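Job type: complex structure
Entries:
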Amino acid sequence: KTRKESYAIYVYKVLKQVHPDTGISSKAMSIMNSFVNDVFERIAGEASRLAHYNKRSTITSREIQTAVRLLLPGELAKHAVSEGTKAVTCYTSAK
Amino acid sequence: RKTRKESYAIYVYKVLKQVHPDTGISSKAMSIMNSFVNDVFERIAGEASRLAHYNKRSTITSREIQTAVRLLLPGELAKHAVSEGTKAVTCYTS
Amino acid sequence: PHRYRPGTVALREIRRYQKSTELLIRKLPFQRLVREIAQDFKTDLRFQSSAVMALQEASEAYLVALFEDTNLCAIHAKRVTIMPKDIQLARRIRGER
Amino acid sequence: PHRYRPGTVALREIRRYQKSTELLIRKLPFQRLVREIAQDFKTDLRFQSSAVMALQEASEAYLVALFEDTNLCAIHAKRVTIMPKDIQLARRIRGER
Amino acid sequence: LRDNIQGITKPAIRRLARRGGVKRISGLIYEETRGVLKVFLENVIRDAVTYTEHAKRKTVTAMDVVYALKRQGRTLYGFG
Amino acid sequence: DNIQGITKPAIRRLARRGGVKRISGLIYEETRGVLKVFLENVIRDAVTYTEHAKRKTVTAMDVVYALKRQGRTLYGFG
Amino acid sequence: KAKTRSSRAGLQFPVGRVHRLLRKGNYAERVGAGAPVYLAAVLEYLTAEILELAGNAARDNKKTRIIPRHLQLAVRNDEELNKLLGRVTIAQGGVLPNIQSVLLP
Amino acid sequence: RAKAKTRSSRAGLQFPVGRVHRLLRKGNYAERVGAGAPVYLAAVLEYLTAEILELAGNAARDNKKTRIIPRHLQLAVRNDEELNKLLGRVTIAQGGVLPNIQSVLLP
């Protein structure tokens, strides 16, 4: 009787968007949870070292963007930059 | 008039004149020693921060620094670094 | 009377064990090995079960990758049989010894 | 009339270049190489001098370590002459290709 | 205790070598492989016990093994 | 173009410092390919740090940070 | 009145939890406004790419449920995902079917 | 209102304790920083610095020199076993290599 937060239901929603007629077991859900935490900590640490190198005190979307370009390889990086910019535009225009 | 640059030149020079009283050091070797001190500082500080995050604490004490030194240095070098740190804290308190 | 030419059962065991996903070491001897070589660090430790399963996963993966690089060294020397100096060359180029 | 047996000048050049510490590449051609293959990322960049010196240090150290591991591969194949498949074996065991 | 490095038998090394893709094996590979495995396991067990002693416990959990392997440069998904 | 400015005697001197007795004749083209791949992967990250810092000059600290990301850690240049 | 930020940005991952985990884990002193939105978009894209490759292998082995073997095959057959997940061991995954040619009869 | 005694003198060190305490507070490691942690860390950094400068000064004496250049740091690090394991993936500029010719190459 104590709470432990994870990413299970969100991975389940993304799976029901791409393949509407399949499921996932518990072990593969544990693997996907570990993958999301791994990539989160890697991008966040890179953005923090950028903000420390430039003598500033704020992590912004430009730091997150440059961390994505340094961390991911080419075509994957271009599609990730496109998706993030589209989300930030749709968030500010729907203020 | 320029903007100041903090370094570790004078302290490395003090340690050198304790350990070899008739020996100098050039500029490039002092730059290498400065980079070495910064590197080892950042390794030990990052590992102690990660231990304090794993155990759900908010404080970096000397016990996290001891465990980080023990994880990060190899063998007898860790065996002597632990002794030097414990001896300095004991002399600092009294 | 019927015998296969030597090499055939080796090739089909290669296919059979690259098709499956299971543990290839017995687990009570591996658990005894872990507890023994942990006894020289702290007396009377008390392992879980998922800790021993995680150690067995990691050890199996390490040995399989080492054998792939060893096989490439032995093919480079224009042989087929793997010898221990191939293991030594692999672990010294990789940066372990 | 006087000529050395082939191998002797090679061994003493090995000793002569392992004794010194200097840059073994000319630096105006290396600077032109750096500016050329940086021109395809951002037009009209402006390098310092210590940046080009740092790149030359790092590149020289990388190539020397690659040649040591290549030499060990060629000795493992019971040869003396280094061939490019030794370079390929070294860079694939190491984890680069 | 003196055994249990002998408990890693010699059809098991054969099965690991065939998942690796190996057709013909010598007869000294067995002792060489036992030495390799004992060195790797010692380096991981030492860091796991260090994390356990710092946490002031007496049991080695799965997360201590995961953190030790992550320090080695070998990430492991599926147990966190 | 300028990759031919990494001449034949220079690769030979790097091989002599590596401890190499006798060299074939295709090592030169193989080595020029290897050096070009390494320099592309480092200069890409150095230019990315420079573009984030809103500059037009590539400093030595950008090279040091890129090499530290690769896992190489040069001492002596800041 | 209570709309979530994820519905405003049009996403599936949470934005409030990403903002809490950025403010709580000692990365910098201040955290902006578009940072959790950008990072949730990036994580959603990477998750969708992995699962899109995994479901096709689950079809090819004629299954309706994903397992770590299917995740292993999906990662290791792709090129850039194999460079992202370069030194990573996936539990209960196995290897790829590789046999050298000089060993074949 | 008393006489100021720096925390390095109170512990018997040579590296600063106040600067290390500031760089831990202003470096985003944790919220709170204890009292004995910079004293412990300055002791460890002084030990490693003295341990490398001993060997570098010995090599500089053996080459009939007075000062220390990066070649002597290279020889000092690469000859010790544990300093070599600590500084394993590190390039020292203007350092060179160690003399090593394989056995099957010389007649």
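Summary: The first helix of chain F runs from residue 8 to 18. Chains F and G do not touch (no CB pair under 8 Å).
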